[PDB]
Amino acid sequence: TTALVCDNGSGLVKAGFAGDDAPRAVFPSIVGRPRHQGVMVGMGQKDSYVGDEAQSKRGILTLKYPIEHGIITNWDDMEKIWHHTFYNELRVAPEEHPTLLTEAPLNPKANREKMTQIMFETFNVPAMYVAIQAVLSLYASGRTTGIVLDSGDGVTHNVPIYEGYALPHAIMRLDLAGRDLTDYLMKILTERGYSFVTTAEREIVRDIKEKLCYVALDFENEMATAASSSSLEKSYELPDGQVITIGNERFRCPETLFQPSFIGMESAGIHETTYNSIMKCDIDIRKDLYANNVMSGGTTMYPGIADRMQKEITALAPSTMKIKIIAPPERKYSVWIGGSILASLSTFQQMWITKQEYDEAGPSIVHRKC
Amino acid sequence: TTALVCDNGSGLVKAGFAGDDAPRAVFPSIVGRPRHQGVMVGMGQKDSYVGDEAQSKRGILTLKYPIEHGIITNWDDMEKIWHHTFYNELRVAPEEHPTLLTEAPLNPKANREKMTQIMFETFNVPAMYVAIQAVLSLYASGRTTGIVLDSGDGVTHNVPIYEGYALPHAIMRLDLAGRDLTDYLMKILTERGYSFVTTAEREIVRDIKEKLCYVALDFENEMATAASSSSLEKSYELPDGQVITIGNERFRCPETLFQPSFIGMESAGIHETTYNSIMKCDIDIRKDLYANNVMSGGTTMYPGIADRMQKEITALAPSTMKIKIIAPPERKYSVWIGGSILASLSTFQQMWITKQEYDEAGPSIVHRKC
Amino acid sequence: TTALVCDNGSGLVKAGFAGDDAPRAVFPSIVGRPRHQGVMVGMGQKDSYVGDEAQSKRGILTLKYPIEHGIITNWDDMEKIWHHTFYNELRVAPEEHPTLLTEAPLNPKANREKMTQIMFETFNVPAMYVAIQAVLSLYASGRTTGIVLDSGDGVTHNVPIYEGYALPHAIMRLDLAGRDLTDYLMKILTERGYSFVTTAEREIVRDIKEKLCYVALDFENEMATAASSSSLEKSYELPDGQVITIGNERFRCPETLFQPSFIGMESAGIHETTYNSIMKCDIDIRKDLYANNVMSGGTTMYPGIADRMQKEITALAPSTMKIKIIAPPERKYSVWIGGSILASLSTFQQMWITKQEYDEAGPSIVHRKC
Amino acid sequence: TTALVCDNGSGLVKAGFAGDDAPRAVFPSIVGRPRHQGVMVGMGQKDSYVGDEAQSKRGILTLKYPIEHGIITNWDDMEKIWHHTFYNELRVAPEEHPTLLTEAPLNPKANREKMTQIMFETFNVPAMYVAIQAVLSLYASGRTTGIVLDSGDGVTHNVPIYEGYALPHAIMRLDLAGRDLTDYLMKILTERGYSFVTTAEREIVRDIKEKLCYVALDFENEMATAASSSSLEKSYELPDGQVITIGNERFRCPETLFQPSFIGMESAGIHETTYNSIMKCDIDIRKDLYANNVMSGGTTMYPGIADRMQKEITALAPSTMKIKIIAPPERKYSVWIGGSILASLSTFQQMWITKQEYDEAGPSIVHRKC
Amino acid sequence: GPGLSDMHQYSQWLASRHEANLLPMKEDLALWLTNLLGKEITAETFMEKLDNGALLCQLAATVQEKKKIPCKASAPSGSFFARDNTANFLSWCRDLGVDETCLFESEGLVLHKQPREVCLCLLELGRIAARYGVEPPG
Amino acid sequence: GPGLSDMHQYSQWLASRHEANLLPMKEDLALWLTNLLGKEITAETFMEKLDNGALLCQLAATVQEKKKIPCKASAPSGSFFARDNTANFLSWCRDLGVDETCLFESEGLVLHKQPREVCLCLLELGRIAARYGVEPPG
Ligand SMILES: Nc1ncnc2c1ncn2[C@@H]1O[C@H](COP(=O)(O)OP(=O)(O)O)[C@@H](O)[C@H]1O
Ligand SMILES: Nc1ncnc2c1ncn2[C@@H]1O[C@H](COP(=O)(O)OP(=O)(O)O)[C@@H](O)[C@H]1O
Ligand SMILES: Nc1ncnc2c1ncn2[C@@H]1O[C@H](COP(=O)(O)OP(=O)(O)O)[C@@H](O)[C@H]1O
Ligand SMILES: Nc1ncnc2c1ncn2[C@@H]1O[C@H](COP(=O)(O)OP(=O)(O)O)[C@@H](O)[C@H]1O
Ligand SMILES: [Mg+2]
Ligand SMILES: [Mg+2]
Ligand SMILES: [Mg+2]
Ligand SMILES: [Mg+2]
């Protein structure tokens, strides 16, 4: 009867039942494999670990993410993450439960085909659907008009919707998000003589950015403030009790969303890409998009990013346009709670791909229903 | 069916049956040969003496250790010591029993090959295995994480282990141990006019070391205290009934573990080699190694050595870390206790080198299996 | 007015005059201090020794390298090595001549800042510059397109340069180089029965490495050949007339460049690190980078390393690409040769840091000019 | 003196002398600027590149077109493209030569005024004229009646002409041409998992479009054939030796000309727009327009486009009408060939704007002469 | 759980108290093992009397008759014998179509570090054994 | 050129073989440089003896006599000294009021990649030098 919703993002799995207020499971989308010689017998050990279990013992493991830039790059490790999700974390038996999955726009077609195949053949799911992540953020934010900006671990995208109609020629995708910012923070922490190199040390600087990074309102004024004073410097304790002290690295990391040039890429920045997709929409739609910029995903969680985005779009857009940014406190879960809303609707129950339609058309059914 | 376990160290043979709580035989790793004319009466004229009978007759003998720094240097005398062990101390036919032997890490490869050859060709055992001494000491400790420091008569070593995985690049060896401390006590006892010169007089100084020596908590204050007062002086009776009085030599001997330059070495000392081995490990392992420093072997039996080691590592490590030294009263037998545990496990019985797979591959099988 | 050029690496100092064909001074980057009591008046004792004189007296000295991984870790000993360089080796007053220093990429910013401070405050140079050492290898190579691989004693790095433009996001660093290979050869010689422990014995094993080691074309065939025959074994005479013999230790040592796992690192190896840097470049640049892989520094001097690098990159790159490795006969000096070229160019003479613009801006002038 | 002819479209500059059968210079209408850090001194390097030199260096450059939709949007960069045209490519002083330029119809008046000003003030031409592009295509075709379809790299237009008279109210314009099809091919190649993002990667997709794309005669039967069979797939080798395979993307790209809805436009498409222009003409002119549809410009060069166009127009027009499509082999150059014809005619030599008329009337002379 | 009311309280609930339904899961298995082993189990004593692996080897020896497995029933808690007993039982699970999701490691019973995975293992074994003449948990 | 008779022949002419009239442009400059510098030049040797930049520095000095420019006349071909000599000449052209378009880059002489833009530079410099008392190319 009740469906289950798995967001299945590039960095974190969010999973739970449709109609729940929040996910029941939230864990990192990693498998880990031991990289050292085992010497003690009797220990009953696994040959690989997933999620918080892999995160917990990362000092003996190499860590791998199966998803990169929203594409499943290792299917054998993705089937372990899905199996851990249904059988440990939710205790489901998926044979009984319709499953809603989610994807970024402008993905390769083979990704949603093979994701459809594995649900019907490995997990034997009765009914299945693949939603676009940004459309779920409008269900969560309770409205039928707006331009969503979504950024996770691997993809940044934006999708304008007006009166429940999407404008697919105006959709934008940007392969700069939280993992690229983590790798750029690792690079600039070498300027202070800190070295982070192993896949387990990447998980330490991810925690440093989540705790200490913020978006400058004016970047040159913060660069002048940090050059002139220690007032902006903060300290962080490493897992072995050493302390690092960081200064302008706190805001130079997030600034890469507004200046993609910092990581070497010829791309406009997060403010220009949402203005450019508003300008690809019809002239009579634009005022309602400027009033409804909706932020979603964990890379939108930096302090000061909504005030920076409000400032930057206001300098691009016409004077007398009333531009507004909607950045709610739960926006790291708004794709999942939007899927929980959608899968519960009585008017949605005709939209599922059922197992008996997959037995007719095969994986190709996902291009005509979703 | 039952298995034999031999510690077989540089100083003492410790031997018995797997599943017993303690070694049944414990005796010095010495062969003694007469240094006077071979026509003796009452002394029981035979070509050579082993272990306890050599130690008993030492006034008429030259004494030789077959093994130095964990390396067997007389193989014919090592075959005398093993023949004495099985037939004269354990009262058993080795043809009937699997035998577990032990080694220090970073030993020459030829040592474990020739040791494997002699067990299958001279003693004709059905099976055997060669364990690392530090890993057995962690079996006796009841745990799967820790940095183990072992010090016997000939070598000191440490192995960091975490969740049953060893980090073999972080292993340290130092060829300074109990025999180097005995030879340094013979040197500094010359300052009070006591001359010990013969191999039988080295065994008297070994007994003076075991009964009177201790580790200073602060060496400069203890040196000032022994210079200021006779209260630190103590007395010992020689085998002829003469008395020696010992003062600061009583803690200057053990201090050589912390200051290797007293015997001329460039090496760092045992508090620095354990710390440098923790700092070779991955950053997420280190906190659990600091909480589990496991002491092992007869050279760790000095009064005050755990309190000194706790102080010295706490001055190297970050002040937020919780240092613990684990130093049980059984720790001169913890390698043997660990071998007795290991050779008894259900999940160990597929790990033996058997006679028929030695017949496939010769001595070289000890490198692929152990 | 002639300029000075100084390679200033870990391991070795290479120094001389701009426009010369080769360095005049080449000596080890060591300070040595006596470790024993000077019992004798006029014995020849002096407080500390530098370079060749420290290498000559090493049996009575502790030896220290002030540079590790390209970072100056002891500034008092570097100031001693620069004083020796100008006044004893080059026989120059540095007050008269501008000086070009060199550095690895991704170094801490304090290292450049302290270098310019000591050159302007202690040595009082007219003007100063800090070049990236891989750009100098491309000057010596006579070309302005290519990916340079540099490896000395402390660090290895690669920089892709397209037409005098660097791609700084594609730059890689690996803190595995010649000293890590020396320390791994010391560890591996213990299997064969040889113990090397002191800082002076590290210099013996470093000479064994430079004379006897080579890179295998296929490692598993050389391991099988070495197991099958004595044909690959070689002998080396120690300073006291003892004889080392080694076999597979000759190629297991430099194989740790191609698989860092042998020394415990979770890192890709030098062929994968070159390929990954080419794949971070723009698609139109890549063909000219595959045709121009340039070797540099003393750790690239092993027999067979260019043939191995050609083989390994050809298995990663597409089959229609023409892979070439440029490995000059003089590549042990190409950083210094490139500095001698660059400091001589008429177009370079307005991009020194002068004493006047250092007195305006302070030592942080080095972050804006260099 | 001999006149010179510049076609000067939004994608390619075509230029040469009047009375020649073909252009002497043909190069991309791009300017390029470095996007990377210059590190090697000595290059004499330019800060900006133009034409085939910018196409050659494109991996280190950001590329910009100073014309979009037939409008010059960057005048500073258009003066560089004209200066490169006269002084490098035609190799001639413009003070000696009357110059014929071209335009699309329904352009803003300011474009031809500023273009008129720059020719008389920056280049000091003796005389100047601006022709409409499609009337030149009819001179190249050798006829005085016909409806011309011109499509290039940003504008599609048609003008009906009868007995040398245009019908200005029947002229149509679509801002869908060439560049829009390259952008749509970039969008659509993401379905295969290929990702093209930089301005340099758009020049790769533009080369893929020119040699693999074609027009389907019946789009639903090609969609059925490509879904059922691999026989429509082709391969392309990228500049780094990777191979991409494409299938229905070959004919889905050009179909956008017949279905503008694919790129989000409300516009009618190429066949309907041509039929609607004929139906705006007088009833007794229409027969000779149906017999004389003349195709022009590089976006008409797809295989199968003339056969599709004849089939689509025949389904709109009355069954008694004889529809013919004239599509020359040389139609990539029809506007330039027609300008070379026109500027050469003896009856045209009174129609030039001369420098004396510009010095009297100013830039607005271009609205009454042209 | 706490829901969306504030995001700090939700992250504190993900980190610990996440699986507060473990106490209900122990109560079913304690009564089932009390019927099946003939040894009295309560949800408070459940880990404290399973942790030497011996009763789980007796569970396998009870369920199998409806490999032979070795065991030291005398093994003390926190020992390598308690680990070795538990490793024989986890091998009997791996021979029975259970996988590295629902399995615990032998340390995870013996040091009490993985009590959820002990319940998930016992439930998965119960659902497979139900096909072969065993009445499963309530 | 080939004309539009075969449409494929013309698009090769634009790229593979666009200046067959390069040799006529070298011939005039070789005899003019031989008159002006006294060093003997031919259209076959032209690139091979200009490519170290040294005779173009002598040209700049000669045309100035009729900034002081630094030069290393001993520089070997394909070197960074040949680039550095040529970069001084190209800077002297920009100080002679020549725009960025008719000039070459220093690599374009030293590696022979841009012999058209070398001839365009020498002709443009010649037309400027005519206003300051040096007789230009034929
Ligand atoms: N406070 C934070 N500050 C910055 N980045 C964060 C923060 N919290 C989480 N993130 C980023 O958000 C990502 C979560 O989104 P992800 O699972 O990849 O996609 P999605 O939003 O579709 O579910 C994390 O992996 C991390 O990179
Ligand atoms: N109580 C003690 N105090 C100090 N040293 C001791 C003590 N007991 C034994 N030793 C020394 O420890 C060494 C023996 O340790 P052991 O672990 O048995 O060595 P091994 O394994 O090589 O046989 C000898 O040097 C001995 O003198
Ligand atoms: N023939 C060689 N084979 C291997 N390593 C070499 C050889 N010659 C020099 N090296 C190594 O080069 C390093 C010298 O230090 P450094 O200045 O950084 O390198 P470089 O020689 O490039 O100047 C040392 O590790 C040294 O052993
Ligand atoms: N073979 C081809 N197939 C498809 N498109 C082409 C082809 N050859 C050229 N093009 C397109 O035609 C354009 C023609 O040039 P353009 O500057 O727009 O002038 P014009 O409109 O007068 O032809 C090119 O820039 C390119 O976009
Ligand atoms: Mg998501
Ligand atoms: Mg012993
Ligand atoms: Mg060097
Ligand atoms: Mg046109």
Side-chain angles (χ1 to χ4, degrees), chain A residues 117-365:
Chain A
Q117 173 163 23
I118 288 164
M119 289 296 133
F120 289 127
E121 293 173 14
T122 299
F123 298 103
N124 195 242
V125 164
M128 183 255 179
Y129 192 87
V130 187
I132 296 296
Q133 285 165 215
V135 174
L136 302 186
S137 311
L138 282 204
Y139 284 106
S141 60
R143 70 191 70 205
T144 53
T145 292
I147 178 168
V148 178
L149 168 65
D150 182 355
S151 57
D153 210 72
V155 187
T156 293
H157 65 275
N158 58 78
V159 178
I161 296 148
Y162 182 84
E163 298 294 332
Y165 298 97
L167 306 178
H169 61 87
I171 295 179
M172 303 282 191
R173 199 201 206 256
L174 169 58
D175 298 5
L176 159 58
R179 198 172 296 174
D180 308 86
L181 301 177
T182 306
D183 295 342
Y184 186 66
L185 185 62
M186 289 197 296
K187 186 180 179 286
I188 74 180
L189 290 178
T190 70
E191 298 180 317
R192 288 186 178 235
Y194 313 119
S195 187
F196 298 104
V197 170
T198 61
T199 61
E201 278 166 345
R202 198 181 196 195
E203 294 298 318
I204 296 167
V205 176
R206 188 186 54 63
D207 192 61
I208 293 161
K209 81 167 175 63
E210 290 182 25
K211 289 194 176 75
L212 296 186
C213 287
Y214 73 97
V215 173
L217 184 74
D218 301 296
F219 178 72
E220 292 190 36
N221 299 77
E222 288 291 268
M223 286 295 289
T225 302
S228 191
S229 188
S230 185
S231 65
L232 290 177
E233 296 187 299
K234 293 188 70 174
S235 305
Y236 178 98
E237 187 189 312
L238 303 182
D240 74 348
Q242 296 183 61
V243 300
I244 73 161
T245 298
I246 66 168
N248 69 17
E249 305 81 5
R250 292 178 64 213
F251 64 83
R252 285 167 61 215
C253 182
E255 184 63 15
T256 307
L257 293 173
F258 296 88
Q259 302 194 53
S261 190
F262 286 8
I263 209 176
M265 68 165 67
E266 191 193 23
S267 190
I270 207 166
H271 60 301
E272 294 293 328
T273 183
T274 57
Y275 173 78
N276 287 344
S277 57
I278 294 168
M279 292 301 291
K280 289 176 82 70
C281 300
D282 189 34
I283 189 164
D284 290 303
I285 286 175
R286 299 184 190 154
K287 184 187 174 185
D288 303 78
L289 300 180
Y290 290 131
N292 290 282
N293 301 272
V294 176
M295 274 173 154
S296 188
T299 294
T300 72
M301 295 296 300
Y302 297 108
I305 198 164
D307 290 338
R308 181 62 176 284
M309 197 74 163
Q310 177 80 40
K311 201 198 86 183
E312 296 286 22
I313 295 174
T314 299
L316 294 174
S319 183
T320 78
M321 287 292 184
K322 304 305 300 288
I323 107 85
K324 173 188 289 283
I325 189 70
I326 298 100
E330 79 299 327
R331 71 186 175 278
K332 72 182 293 183
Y333 302 114
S334 65
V335 173
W336 189 93
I337 76 205
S340 178
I341 288 161
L342 175 60
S344 304
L345 301 183
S346 187
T347 193
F348 178 76
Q349 307 310 313
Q350 305 305 335
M351 306 300 171
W352 302 102
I353 302 155
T354 63
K355 180 54 166 64
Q356 60 267 35
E357 291 160 289
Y358 180 83
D359 289 345
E360 183 185 349
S364 76
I365 193 64

Side-chain angles (χ1 to χ4, degrees), chain F residues 95-116:
Chain F
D95 283 353
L96 213 80
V98 182
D99 66 77
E100 298 83 358
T101 61
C102 291
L103 300 175
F104 55 106
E105 293 186 327
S106 76
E107 191 89 337
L109 174 62
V110 179
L111 294 174
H112 322 143
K113 304 200 300 178
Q114 303 189 328
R116 189 184 78 163

Side-chain angles (χ1 to χ4, degrees), chain B residues 7-14:
Chain B
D7 169 60
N8 194 51
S10 294
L12 293 105
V13 185
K14 323 173 190 163

Side-chain angles (χ1 to χ4, degrees), chain D residues 162-177:
Chain D
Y162 182 87
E163 300 298 328
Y165 301 95
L167 294 92
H169 62 88
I171 297 181
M172 320 277 283
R173 180 181 163 137
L174 320 179
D175 294 341
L176 155 49

Side-chain angles (χ1 to χ4, degrees), chain D residues 21-26 40-46 49 53 57 83 87-89 91 329-330 333 337, chain F residues 4 7 10 13-14 18-19 21 80 83 87 94 99-103 105-107 114 116-117 120:
Chain D
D21 280 352
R24 285 180 66 165
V26 184
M40 303 190 85
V41 77
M43 294 299 291
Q45 260 164 350
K46 297 186 294 186
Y49 299 100
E53 191 174 32
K57 300 190 191 299
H83 191 296
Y87 294 100
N88 293 59
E89 291 292 301
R91 213 161 297 133
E330 69 275 16
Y333 304 101
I337 296 158
Chain F
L4 298 169
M7 192 68 267
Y10 179 75
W13 173 82
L14 288 173
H18 196 188
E19 279 93 8
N21 60 353
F80 276 96
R83 270 164 269 221
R94 295 170 190 171
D99 66 77
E100 298 83 358
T101 61
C102 291
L103 300 175
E105 293 186 327
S106 76
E107 191 89 337
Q114 303 189 328
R116 189 184 78 163
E117 282 66 37
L120 294 175

Side-chain angles (χ1 to χ4, degrees), chain D residues 7-14 27-29 65 102 133 137 150-157 177-179 181-182 206 209-211 213 296-303 331-336:
Chain D
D7 182 348
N8 196 51
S10 58
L12 303 177
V13 187
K14 293 71 65 183
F27 66 86
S29 196
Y65 287 93
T102 88
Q133 284 165 4
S137 309
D150 195 75
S151 61
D153 207 286
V155 56
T156 290
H157 59 277
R179 201 174 300 171
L181 306 179
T182 303
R206 198 270 297 145
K209 188 178 108 284
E210 287 182 27
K211 74 188 63 157
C213 288
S296 178
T299 292
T300 71
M301 296 296 290
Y302 295 111
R331 71 188 176 276
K332 188 164 174 165
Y333 304 101
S334 293
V335 176
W336 191 91

Side-chain angles (χ1 to χ4, degrees), chain C residues 7 9-12 14 152-153 178 206 209-210 297-298 301-302 332:
Chain C
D7 172 51
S10 299
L12 300 175
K14 297 165 170 169
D153 194 61
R206 201 270 298 149
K209 185 197 71 181
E210 292 178 20
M301 295 298 299
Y302 300 102
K332 193 165 66 175

